[PDB]
Amino acid sequence: LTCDQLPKAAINPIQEFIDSNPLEFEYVLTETFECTTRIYVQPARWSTTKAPTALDIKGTQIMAYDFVGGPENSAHLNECHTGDKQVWYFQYTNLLTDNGSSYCAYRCNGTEIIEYKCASNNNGTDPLQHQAMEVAKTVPNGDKIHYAKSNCPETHGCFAFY
Amino acid sequence: LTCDQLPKAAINPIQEFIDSNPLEFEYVLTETFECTTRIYVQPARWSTTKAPTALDIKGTQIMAYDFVGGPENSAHLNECHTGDKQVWYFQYTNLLTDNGSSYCAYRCNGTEIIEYKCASNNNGTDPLQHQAMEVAKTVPNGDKIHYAKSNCPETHGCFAFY
Ligand SMILES: *[C@@H]1O[C@H](CO)[C@@H](O)[C@H](O)[C@H]1NC(C)=O
Ligand SMILES: *[C@@H]1O[C@H](CO)[C@@H](O)[C@H](O)[C@H]1NC(C)=O
Ligand SMILES: *[C@@H]1O[C@H](CO)[C@@H](O)[C@H](O)[C@H]1NC(C)=O
Ligand SMILES: *[C@@H]1O[C@H](CO)[C@@H](O)[C@H](O)[C@H]1NC(C)=O
C-alpha cells in the first residue's frame, strides 16, 4: 500500500467539525503536532474566500490554515502566516456519535506519507481510529506515525489548553 | 465615573458567542491585544469543569482562558498556561444581528480600568461599540484605550489570521 492508495473519505459539512471542537491529536507523524489541540472555525464575515479555518494549537503557539475543498475529497489548506499550500485527505471520519467524534487525516508526497493527524474528542476510544492508524503505518514513511500525547506539559486548570 | 460603576451587562448564552466566531478586537487598553482575533470554544467533552474557553490569537501566539460565570454578570477567567485568574464584565453585548456581532468587555482593579476588549465581526460598525468605548475612556486609566488595528502585519491569504 502507498500513500496515494489510502482512502479519500468524504469530508463532512464544516458545521459537524465545528460542533466537534475541541479535538486533540492522538497520532501524528512529525513532532510538530504532538500535544496539539485542533479547533475548526467558520469563515469570517469579512472573508472574501469564505473559507473556514483549521487551528493547530500547541501550548501558546498556533498554526492556522484557511481551507477549501478540491478534487477527489481533498482539502486545500493555505497556511495563514506564509501562504504555503498543503493538500490533505481524510482516511475516515466519524463525527458526532454517542461517543463523540474522531477522524484521521493525512498528507502525501506521492507514494510516501509526510504528515498524519488523527484527532478525537473521546481520548482515542473510537475503534476506527487505532485501526486507521495501523493502516497508515503500512505506507512508505508510515513508520514515523506515533502516539501524540506521551509527554505533554502539565495543565494549569484547563483541559484542552496548557 | 469609575470602573466599578460601568454597566455589568447580562452575558449571552455561550453558543451565541461561538456562533459569532471569528471576532477581531477594535479597541483595547494595553498593547497585548492589538491585532488579535477572538475565538470562543465550547467545553471539551473530557473537561471536568465543563467551562468554555476564550482564545486570544495574535499571529502565531495564543492565550487561552477557561471561564465560568460568577456574581453580578462576572466572567471568571483561568489563564490556561499559568492558572492566573481574571475577573471580567461586559459593558454591553449585541450578538447575531443582521449586521453581525459586537461587544465590549473590561477588567477593573477597583476604580481603575486595567484592560479593555471591544470585539466585533463587522469591522467596528455597530454604533453601540464606539459609544461604549467613549464611555470606558472616561473612567480612571481609560485614557489608554485605543484602536486595536492601526499597524497589523500583512496577511498571506487568510482573513482572521496572519
Ligand atoms: C514533494 O517532494 C519533492 C522532492 O523534494 C518536492 O520537489 C515537491 O515540492 C514535494 N511536493 C509538494 C506538493 O510540495
Ligand atoms: C486517555 O488515554 C490514555 C491511554 O491511551 C490514558 O493514559 C489516559 O489516562 C486517558 N485519559 C482519561 C481521562 O481517561
Ligand atoms: C489590584 O492592584 C493591587 C495593587 O497593586 C494588587 O495588590 C491586587 O492584586 C490587584 N487586584 C487583583 C484582583 O489582581
Ligand atoms: C475596517 O475599518 C477601517 C476604518 O476604521 C478601515 O480602514 C478598513 O478599510 C475597514 N475594512 C474594510 C474591509 O472595510
CB contact under 8 A, A160 and B63: no
Q: What are phi and psi of B73, to 5 degrees?
A: 65, 30
- Closest ligand to C-alpha of residue A113 is 1
Pairing between β-strand A75-79 and β-strand A85-97 as defined by DSSP bridges = antiparallel
- B156 has a chain A CB within 8 A of its CB: yes
CB contact under 8 A, A81 and B60: yes
A12 DSSP 8-state letter: P
Of A45, A46, A47, the residue with max ligand 4 atoms within 8 A of its CB, to mutate for a pocket test, comes to A46
Distances in whole angstroms, Cα of residue A8 to Cα of each of A54, A61, A90, B143, B153: 19, 30, 6, 55, 36
CA-wise closest residue to A105 among A73, A65, A151: A73
Q: Which atom of ligand 4 is nearest to the CA of A46?
A: 13
* Residues 6 or more apart whose Cβ sits within 8 Å of residue B115: B28, B29, B30, B32, B33, B106, B107
- Residue B67, beta-bridge partner list: B77
Amino acid identity of residue A64, one-letter, is A
- A120 has a chain B CB within 8 A of its CB: no
Neighbours of A14 (CB within 10 A): 17
CA–CA gap between residue B46 and residue A22 (Å, rounded): 10
CA–CA gap between residue A89 and residue A72 (Å, rounded): 9
Residues 46-105 of chain B with CB under 8 A from chain A are 46-49, 51, 53, 55, 57, 59-66, 78-83, 100
CA-wise closest residue to B64 among A60, A109, A10, A39: A60
Pairing between β-strand B23-28 and β-strand B112-120 as defined by DSSP bridges = antiparallel
Q: Which domain holds residue B66?
A: 1-162
CA–CA gap between residue A132 and residue A122 (Å, rounded): 16
Neighbours of A127 (CB within 10 A): 11
Candidates B43, B47, B80; nearest CB to A156 = B80
Q: Residue A60: exposed, middle, or buried by beta-carbon count in 10 A (0-12, 13-18, 19+)?
A: middle
Amino acid identity of residue A66, one-letter, is D
Ligand 2 pocket by Cβ (under 6 Å): A 123-124; B 46
- Residue B99, beta-bridge partner list: none
* Residues 6 or more apart whose Cβ sits within 8 Å of residue B21: A41, A42, B38, B39, B40, B121
Cell of B129: 461599540
Instruction: State the DSSP H helix or E strand holding residue B10, giving kind and residue range, or none if neither.
Output: none
Torsional sign, CA A65, A69, A71, A72: positive
Structural biology method used: X-ray
CA–CA gap between residue A47 and residue A3 (Å, rounded): 33
CA–CA gap between residue B95 and residue B53 (Å, rounded): 18
Candidates A39, A59, A82; nearest CB to B39 = A39
Instruction: Give how many domains chain A has, as a whole number.
Output: 1
Helices (H), ranges, A10-160 = 14-18, 127-136
CA–CA gap between residue B148 and residue B119 (Å, rounded): 10
- Locate cell 449585541: which residue? B94
Cell of A38: 485542533
| Final resolution, Å | 1.5
**Are A115 and A30 contacting, i.e. CB atoms less than 8 angstroms apart?**
yes
CA distance A64 to chain B (A): 7
Amino acid identity of residue A30, one-letter, is T
- Give SS3 for B160: coil
* Residues 6 or more apart whose Cβ sits within 8 Å of residue B93: B9, B10, B11, B12, B102, B103
